[PDB]
Ligand binder design. Structure first.
Ligand SMILES: *[C@@H](CCCl)C(=O)c1cccc(C(=O)N[C@H](C(=O)OC)C(C)C)c1
Ligand SMILES: *[C@@H](CCCl)C(=O)c1cccc(C(=O)N[C@H](C(=O)OC)C(C)C)c1
Lengths: 302, 302
């Protein structure tokens, strides 16, 4: 019993974190086999941050301009290249702790664990969701760039996020491990801002099932609704549309609780229209949308 | 920016988790140097669960009755003993991954990371607080017994919790690493239940400071209060009394935000008396009390 925002165990990732310094700029890197991955803005300085041409900046560097430290061991850089917004530093040593891994790009509404790091040293681990507007609501301080987001499936680490910046609203933006940004953000100084966001409906319904599995039932009702009528309400409250595929994905949880998906949707409609009247669900007084159906099944199966 | 429930990186702990089987009962153990620690109820069977005499149960076992598996390696048990409600299994191999560690008992209102494990395999990591009534609101399924709670300070792991059981309300109880229960709970089948609980005031105030540091200011006011008047309100809302030591502990956060502790207490009094009028603080619609002053300083310093 119980329902917590749970992250994957971080040890496999911890053994990949290093510190990358170029000039007086330092940040974190990810050491896999004989390559270190980090944000390419490590080669930029305060003077070029407005319209930097990264191809020019990199052509003017050599391997000796990069210091890579893995704990108290200095790694010799033997090559450097750029891939989109990530820098690849070839080092002369393959990381002996490299896990089985994949570079996967995630979808908005999916969750992942973040290992916050500073100066190549892990500091904390927590769960995040990619928002519909392609930002993440992280916890990151100065020096956290290069920290990564990941999921683990049977000892294989699927890396999905590298941290690059903080937007003016305090939310965060970055890229996939191939250096391609999530969202319409760039690694330079502009007035860029998070676009409008929406609530991830399928996740809210998953979490209502979690709650039922954990004995919170007060929000249930005898009613049902059609998908079309439900989605009329969703649109009114800035919730994403629910699709038949979402209904199918919720099938297992529906079957375990005996509550049809469109029945739980009737409950969600009532909650949106009426609030909670002072009650809580799984210890929250608002509707939580950063648990996927998979997250719920993982933590609630028993 | 940002504020998340953040756990410590779990890798140091992950390398200590093993599986312990006695008969058909299996659970998790903690392998440090050449000792494996686990709940002593692993030696109990369904027939004895009402009034087990553990001294009798253990005298009837030998080393060969315990199977310890560390990954795919079987560890040879060469001794067994009991210490309060934990079993100590001496094995013939010192864990090469043993971190620097301490066994420390924590106070109600303090937080710690939990590494949930099944069959000696880590599954997830999350933050918990020891409640004033000595329970924890965890996330644990069948097979999670023997999972541990810990804090990490400069590479030294302070273990503070081993998981033993789930109470009827779905909250959790266990012991310290010396096998002494937190709270008035026992490792046998009774009608035992969590006692009345209260909210951890000093932590709520810490979190209000976190919020101010992260730009949530709407709940601030021009008022102050005395400690005595504040505590009259606290008692009315089932909040713990605030002490001068709590005020002193909040000194740094007060100084960073420029908001005197008793000023923030005036804000808390208004929030308790009036609710939030539909607003949120750090993405919550209720007052959060599972962050200590230390947790806030760790995550907000920048
Ligand atoms: C980024 C963490 C943000 Cl939450 C981080 O650790 C970091 C390290 C080093 C340098 C920067 C940085 O800000 N670089 C500039 C920038 O602001 O990005 C747009 C450059 C000069 C464009 C960040
Ligand atoms: C406990 C996890 C609870 Cl959230 C766990 O993994 C476990 C493993 C093996 C056996 C038990 C168990 O329940 N034992 C009995 C009990 O219910 O504890 C009071 C014994 C027989 C007293 C739990």
């Amino acid at each position: 019993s119980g329902f917590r925002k749970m992250a994957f165990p971080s040890g496999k990732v911890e053994g990949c974190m290093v510190q990358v310094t170029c000039g007086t700029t330092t940040l974190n890197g990810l050491w896999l086999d004989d390559v270190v991955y980090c944000p390419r803005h490590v080669i930029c300085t305060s003077e070029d941050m407005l319209n930097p041409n990264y191809e020019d900046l990199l052509i003017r560097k050599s391997n000796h301009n990069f210091l890579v430290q893995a704990g108290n061991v200095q790694l010799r850089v033997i090559g450097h290249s750029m891939q989109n917004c990530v820098l690849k530093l070839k080092v002369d040593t393959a990381n002996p702790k490299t896990p089985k891994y994949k570079f996967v790009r995630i979808q908005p509404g999916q969750t992942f664990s973040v290992l916050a790091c500073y100066n190549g040293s892990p500091s904390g681990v927590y769960q995040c969701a990619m928002r519909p507007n392609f930002t993440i609501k992280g916890s990151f301080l100065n020096g956290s760039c290069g920290s990564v987001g990941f999921n683990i499936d049977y000892d294989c680490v699927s890396f999905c996020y590298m941290h690059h910046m903080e937007l003016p609203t305090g939310v965060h933006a970055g890229t996939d491990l191939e250096g391609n940004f999530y969202g319409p953000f760039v690694d330079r100084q502009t007035a860029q801002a998070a676009g409008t966001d929406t609530t991830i409906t399928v996740n809210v319904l998953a979490w209502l099932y979690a709650a039922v599995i954990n004995g919170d039932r007060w929000f249930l009702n005898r009613f049902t609704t059609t998908l079309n009528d439900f989605n009329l309400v969703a649109m009114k409250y800035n919730y994403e549309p629910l699709t038949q595929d979402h209904v199918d994905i919720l099938g297992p949880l529906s079957a375990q609780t005996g509550i049809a998906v469109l029945d739980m949707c009737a409950s969600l409609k009532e909650l949106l229209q009426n609030g909670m009247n002072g009650r809580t669900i799984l210890g929250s007084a608002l509707l939580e949308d950063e648990f996927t159906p998979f997250d719920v099944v993982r933590q609630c199966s028993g």
